[PDB]
Amino acid sequence: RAKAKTRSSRAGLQFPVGRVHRLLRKGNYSERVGAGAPVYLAAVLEYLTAEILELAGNAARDNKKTRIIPRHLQLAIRNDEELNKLLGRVTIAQGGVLPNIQAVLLPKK
Amino acid sequence: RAKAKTRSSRAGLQFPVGRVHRLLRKGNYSERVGAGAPVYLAAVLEYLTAEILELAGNAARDNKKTRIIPRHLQLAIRNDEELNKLLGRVTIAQGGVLPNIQAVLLPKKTESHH
Amino acid sequence: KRKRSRKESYSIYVYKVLKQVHPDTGISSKAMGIMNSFVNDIFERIAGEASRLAHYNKRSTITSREIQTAVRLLLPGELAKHAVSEGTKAVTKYTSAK
Amino acid sequence: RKRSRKESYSIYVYKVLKQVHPDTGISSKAMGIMNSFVNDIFERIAGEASRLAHYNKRSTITSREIQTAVRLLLPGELAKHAVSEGTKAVTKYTSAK
Amino acid sequence: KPHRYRPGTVALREIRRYQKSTELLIRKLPFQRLVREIAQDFKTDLRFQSSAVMALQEACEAYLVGLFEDTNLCAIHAKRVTIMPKDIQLARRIRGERA
Amino acid sequence: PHRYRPGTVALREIRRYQKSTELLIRKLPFQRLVREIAQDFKTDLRFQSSAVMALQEACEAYLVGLFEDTNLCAIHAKRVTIMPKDIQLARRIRGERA
Amino acid sequence: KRHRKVLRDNIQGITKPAIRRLARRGGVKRISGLIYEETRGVLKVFLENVIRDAVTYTEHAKRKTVTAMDVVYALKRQGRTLYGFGG
Amino acid sequence: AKRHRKVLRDNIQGITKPAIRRLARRGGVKRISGLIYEETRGVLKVFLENVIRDAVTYTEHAKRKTVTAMDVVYALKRQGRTLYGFGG
Ligand SMILES: [Ca+2]
Ligand SMILES: [Cl-]
Ligand SMILES: [Cl-]
């Protein structure tokens, strides 16, 4: 017998390729699932996850906080043009809104 | 031995219960499909089809026209509050739009017809 | 080659239903195309939601009850009453035929 | 009696968080949001892939489907990096076998 | 002589206060009752997980805050500063929520 | 000698075009545009003629609907004339625009 | 016992100052007095549509309790997808 | 010899003023500011890009060089502009 290596480890991935692969087979998407698919999908899920936490973390730092909380995710997403589009019809609980006050509503001074 | 009775006739439907049942199995919806699912579904599709056809047929008749055309389907759908909501993010090729001119755009003066 | 492949449609049926509802009116090909798009649209919505339902409740099976709940979710008020009615009637009649 | 198993992406979100910000942590609510995200996008990509394969009269979702799904669902720059990182990961997983 | 802020200035201050924050702005129990009221109309003697009531409230307030943004644009569109119900009705009509 | 007041022939046209269902953009220009826009995605592409029609049908529907929404924004500002800000506000509120 | 649910007209518990706060987050500076009731009706329609679907999800599952997933699946259907309560 | 296709440029202008007016008429517009026509062209172009992008994406996934009505129908569905009467 050979030793057990995970497919994530073979892909240099932190996301669980094996789990994804099972979710695909068990979620009524297709009769069959190629072995490239979950590796690629778990890859993309990891990239986007990392992308958001890069930007969420920076917002936690600007807030002088060690831990990311929803508001930091919301600031990350709503100030990033692409992430915002991706999640344009998504509500992030406990996130609030970006500070925006129309110019017309400000004092004349 | 004793043969040949189509599920649709049994249910009293024009719509194809057997085609519908095949389409559910092969369409990646669920591992298994029960026997009432396609009967019920076919019936519902027949019902909605028959509404639109009834209304659009009426529209073609008002037009002094034997044949239903996309505009007859559009007029049917958009003057039926409910069909309009079901099909409100749907575009009917060659239907046009319902006559409608906001009141502030009209002139106001009434002096009339024969 | 020589003969174009078969592409299914609901045309014969749409027509069958048409004769029921109006015996002496016909339908242009574009209009029939819209009707076929309509049926396929709704099939896909109802089956879709039925599919979610079953999956959301850990059932492997889409049954007549999932169609019904989905029909209640997708159609507006009056349309859904009659729809559920016709669906109920049809399954009934179909078990009577045995 | 032990509670029934609710799986999640939370050990993997953390692992990525340590890669990206080794000093930074995450609250429950944020993890819930991260977890909702992952599932959302799982389903969007897998869904579009299911359609792609079905439109092209094929039984199999392959990486080629996931990729074209990604192309359709993510915005430009986000699409590009996803495709790269998905290709990397495959090309790599293939060479290990 | 007693200090008074001109009209607009405490409003502008509130905007900033609430845009900085994420607390729910409807009082929890009133909300929770309303939900149950409304829920009777479809099924009798229903219980709720509190997370279900929080999920609804999160969802509502998010939708209303969202609708207010579009309502504020419609008001400003017509050369005003004061949101009025026709603003809301226009926002929702363009949103396609309403006929 | 004879001349209609401003807005009269406009109303007449509204009545004319809401009554009909023909495409209102000219077909060949539309086609040329499609081909051109397509070139920035893949070179030497061909187009089924129905695919161009399908895109024209869609465009024209999209725009006619946008103009409806645009008119309402004009009228909300106590105007009879549509202007770019009316198109922008509509598109902002629809979710198309930032 | 069994403690009946008294329909108290709670839509009025959605106070004026609450509606005003929501609008401040929305960036609204000035508010017609007609707003506060318009809103309540807008809110009610929102709540009915979400709660109807949610409760439909509850009924199909043969449960007496509306869960946070019922609500989530409801908001997904209504195109108002919510992160942070499961799914 | 044999030569492949050639470049087209600024065809957006073929979407003329009369046709923009006609569309607006059908949308019930009575009076049109003169800046509309260039704005409408911008808007139309963004719409077509987003739809043609997705259609062409479907084409390449079917390893085709011909864009089909179904590619367009499928793209418009994804865009939430579901269209009936071309292959639904
Ligand atoms: Ca870093
Ligand atoms: Cl594969
Ligand atoms: Cl069944």
Task: Characterise this structure.
The structure is cut from a larger assembly and holds two copies of chain A, two copies of chain C, two copies of chain E and two copies of chain G. Chain C has 98 residues and is mainly alpha-helical. In chain C, 72% of the residues lie in helices and 4% in strands. The longest helix of chain C has 28 residues. Chain C is globular, with a radius of gyration of 17 Å. Chain C starts with 10 loop residues before the first helix and ends with a helix. Chain E is built from four helices and two strands, in the order ααβαβα. With 99 residues, chain E is mainly α. Chain G starts with 15 loop residues before the first helix and ends with a strand. The interface between A and D is large, with 62 and 62 residues.
Secondary structure layout:
The structure is cut from a larger assembly and holds 2 copies of chain A, 2 copies of chain C, 2 copies of chain E and 2 copies of chain G.
Chain A lengths: L6 H5 L5 H9 L6 E2 L2 H27 L4 E2 L1 H9 L2 H6 L3 E3 L17
Helix pairs in contact in A: 2-3, 3-4
Chain E lengths: L8 H12 L7 H13 L6 E2 L1 H28 L4 E2 L1 H10 L5
Helix pairs in contact in E: 3-4
Chain G lengths: L15 H10 L4 E2 L3 H26 L4 E2 L1 H10 L3 E3 L4
The complex binds calcium ion (CA) and chloride ion (2 copies).
The site of one chloride ion has 4 residues of chain B, from loops.
Treating each run of at least 4 consecutive H or I residues as one helix, how many helices of chain C?
4
Could you describe the largest sheet of chain E, including whether it forms a barrel? Answer: none
Binned, the helix content of chain C reads over 70%
Estimated share of beta-strand residues of chain C = under 5%
Approximate shape of chain E: extended
Tell me how many strands of chain C there are: 2
Oligomeric description of these chains: part of a larger assembly
How large is the radius of gyration of chain C?
A: 17 Å
Q: What's the main sheet of chain C like?
A: none
Query: Roughly what fraction of the amino acids of chain E lie in strands?
Result: under 5%
Secondary-structure element series of chain E: HHEHEH
**What's the alpha carbon Rg of chain E, rounded to whole Å?**
18 Å
Spell out the helices and strands of chain C N to C.
HEHEHH
Bound molecules: calcium ion, chloride ion
Q: Can you count the beta strands of chain E? A: 2
Helix content of chain E: 55-70%
Q: Distance between the terminal alpha carbons of chain C, to the nearest Å?
A: 43 Å
End-to-end span of chain E in angstroms? 53 Å
Structural class of chain E: mainly alpha
- Number of contiguous helices of chain E: 4
